[PDB]
Structures are given as C-alpha cells and as structure tokens.
Design a protein around this ligand. Structure first.
Ligand SMILES: O=C(O)c1cc(Cl)c2oc3ccccc3c(=O)c2c1
Ligand SMILES: O=C(O)c1cc(Cl)c2oc3ccccc3c(=O)c2c1
Ligand SMILES: [Ca+2]
Ligand SMILES: [Ca+2]
Ligand SMILES: [Ca+2]
Ligand SMILES: [Ca+2]
Lengths: 115, 115, 115, 115
C-alpha cells in the first residue's frame, strides 16, 4: 500500500486511536470524490487505504476528523478537521506516510516519501 | 480586525511574504462561498480581511497558497495548499490569529483566540 | 530589542503568560554563563532581554520553564523545559524572534532572523 | 529497549539518516553525564540506546546534532542542536519514542509514551 496515515496526540503523548478520516480524489470538474476511508488503529495508524494500481497521479485530500477525537476526550478544539491536500507524483517507487500531530488549537502535518 | 493570518518560512527563518490566501464561508446549502482574500505583507501578515459586522458565526476555511510560494523559491513542495477549517464566533465574537509555519514537506497551523 | 521570545499555548489557543526563561551564553571555558532572564507578558512575549551592545557574537541558550507553566494548569508534561541553542551575530548583528509553541507532550521552536 | 529516537527531515520529506545524538543523565551535582549515543539508521530511527534495567527514573537530555545534518546538505541552520530534556517516570510499563521533526529554522519534538 502506497499511502499510510499516522495520527498522534500531543496532549496525552500517545497515538490517536479511533480517528476517522476520508480520502478524496479531485475530479475533472474540481469536485472531491470519495476514494477511501477508515479509522486509526491502536497504534494511531491507518493502513490499507489503497493499492499501487488504484493510486494514480492526481490531487488527493485527506480529511481527518480531529474535532470528534477531541470531543470524545472532553476538550474543546479549534479546527473542524485536519486537511492534507497534495499531488501524488510518479518519480520512481514511492510510498507516502502522512503524519498528523494533534493539539486542540494546533496541528502539524508532515509527509515522509520513501522509495 | 477579528481575523488575521500570519505565515512563516521555516527554511529561511523569515516571514513568508506575498503568500496568497482565500477565505470561504460554508453556506446553508453546504457549499463554500467566497468570503475574503489577500496576500501577506513584508511582515508575513495579512490584516483587514473582514469586519466585526461581516464576520458572523459560521464555518470558515482559509486556503493558503503554499505551493506557489515554494515554487517561486525553486522548491517543489508536498502540499497543494495549507487549509484551516474552523467554526467562528459560536459563543459570541472573538478575535482570531491563525499562524501557518511552512516547510516544503510539513506545515503547522495554530490559532490564538481572544475575547 | 535584538532578542525577543514569544510563547504560545496550543491547548488553550492563547499566549502562554508568565512563563519564566533564562538565557545563557557559552563562555571561553565552555561553561554556560548567565546572560539574561525574564517572564512572558500577557501577550506571551518577553521583550527587553538585552541590547545591541551587550548581545555580542556567541552561542546562546534559552531555557524556557515549560514544566512550571503546565503544572500550574494541572497538567504533568513530558519535558522539563524547552531549550533553544543557537549561534548569534556570526555575520554581524541580527534581530532574533524565537517562538515556542507548547503542548504537554510536544513543542516546537522557530526563529525569525532579520537584518 | 524503553527509549527510541526518530528524526525526520521536513525539507526533503524523508527520514533524517546518519544524525548523531548523545543521551545524558543528570547527576546529583547537576552536571550531565554521558549515558548513551548513536546515529540514526536509514529509517531515521535510533534503537537500542539502553535497557529496562539501566533506564531508571531521573532527568535525561537527548542532544541531537542537527547542525551537522544541515551542514552536510549545504543548508544554513539556526540551531546548534536539538535538545530534549525530560524526566523518566515509572507509571506502569512504559516505552518512550521521541520524534524530532527538523527544518533549518525550526524543529518540533514530541514524545509518544506507550504501555
Ligand atoms: O509574532 C511573531 O513575530 C512570531 C514569530 C514566530 Cl518565530 C512565530 O512562530 C510561530 C511558530 C508556530 C506557531 C506560531 C508562531 C507564531 O505565532 C510566531 C509569531
Ligand atoms: O513512528 C513513531 O513511533 C513516531 C513517533 C512520533 Cl512521537 C512521531 O512524531 C512525529 C511528529 C511530527 C511529525 C511526524 C512524527 C512521526 O512520524 C512520529 C512517528
Ligand atoms: Ca509525472
Ligand atoms: Ca452559537
Ligand atoms: Ca563571525
Ligand atoms: Ca514515581
């Protein structure tokens, strides 16, 4: 699988478990069509979203439901969700790991792209 | 000035100057309506986007054109744009400062909210 | 004001107020000599630490007492302090703004350096 | 092994390979004594620094040589090193993963503590 998402909780110092997210692919009319989705595991990771053959070049959006995560912990957050929008680019063999580090009023997102 | 956006460049250690961004507000039909737009100044800040009267309760999206910023510096970055989606003014008027810290393969977005 | 430090709280979305910090400068014998100290204001900023004449070339360390900040809010954080170590003024005088973004189990430190 | 360190490069979107670091433990006289050291692997990770029996409660410092990493890439950095200072605390079974996300003028450090 060429795309994995990892989510971490900066308040508790833990993987962020049971975080829902949807992946969309941008269509020719500039709309977002659903592509894949799931929830993070006990390790904070979501594997198996797609396959090499399906994950073609294009613009993708990962929408991570961070608000529901914080609400379950009883903490008021700022963001409605965390958004990661990127172009997949074929330059040799590539695997994408997207990490989201979550705080109630801040998040960071990083891509590690490896061969 | 109930909404201000500040953008910083983590490669150069500088304000990110001339960064374009568009603000949208979610309409009753769930579409994103244009709300305001502008570019960061030499200080990396964009002031004057809206007014207290115009900045009603709602869900807002700030799309910061980080890709064009990096490309003009000779860097091909990961993200298409940095996106910040948030509910504003749900408990009455607040002042929002959104800061985006940019690197080619990572960014963070933080909000300081004051009454 | 060639050195300013700003501290933000990513849990509350606010300036981090009354945060103590100590600045040290490396002496010729490799020990850390006291240089300046202070606490952040209601804006989360600490101004006036030094002057252009006093802030000579050297290696400086800013130790920000993040642990006491979190403990007073009822949180037991991971880090003892946030540490920022840097060479200053190696190519002539510069102005340094150091920002620390704090969460209980994570922090970031960023510098904006201007001529 | 109860302590692992992972280092990521936010400019290239990659693990930060061959990054040297030293771990110190604070002594009773407030000096830092060497405890362990190594360099990150091709995955950006440094494993095997210590053992359960050796890693007792106390204050530890991880000093990551980020300046040498950026210098090898020909990029001028801000920090002399990245410093992570924390107290190890016995509260049930615990494994510490310290992640450092590096940019030339900014870094973030996060602890994920798991059972
Ligand atoms: O007000 C400033 O001059 C200033 C300078 C720096 Cl380095 C800053 O870095 C940051 C890094 C992460 C999140 C927010 C900020 C800031 O809000 C910020 C503001
Ligand atoms: O592989 C891990 O266990 C692990 C642990 C931590 Cl704390 C991590 O923090 C991070 C903080 C910012 C950006 C990426 C990561 C990680 O990719 C990451 C991975
Ligand atoms: Ca291509
Ligand atoms: Ca309301
Ligand atoms: Ca010099
Ligand atoms: Ca104990």
């Amino acid at each position: 699988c060429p795309l994995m998402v990892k989510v971490l909780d900066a308040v508790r110092g833990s993987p962020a478990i049971n975080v829902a997210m949807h992946v969309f692919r941008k269509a020719a009319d500039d709309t977002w069509e659903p592509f894949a989705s799931g929830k993070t595991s006990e390790s904070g990771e979501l594997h198996g979203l797609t396959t090499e053959e399906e994950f073609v070049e294009g613009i993708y959006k990962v929408e991570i439901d961070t608000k529901s995560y914080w609400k379950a912990l009883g903490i008021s957050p700022f963001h409605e969700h965390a958004e990661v929008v990127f172009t997949a680019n074929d330059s040799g063999p590539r695997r994408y790991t997207i990490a989201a580090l979550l705080s109630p009023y801040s998040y960071s997102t990083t891509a590690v792209v490896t061969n």
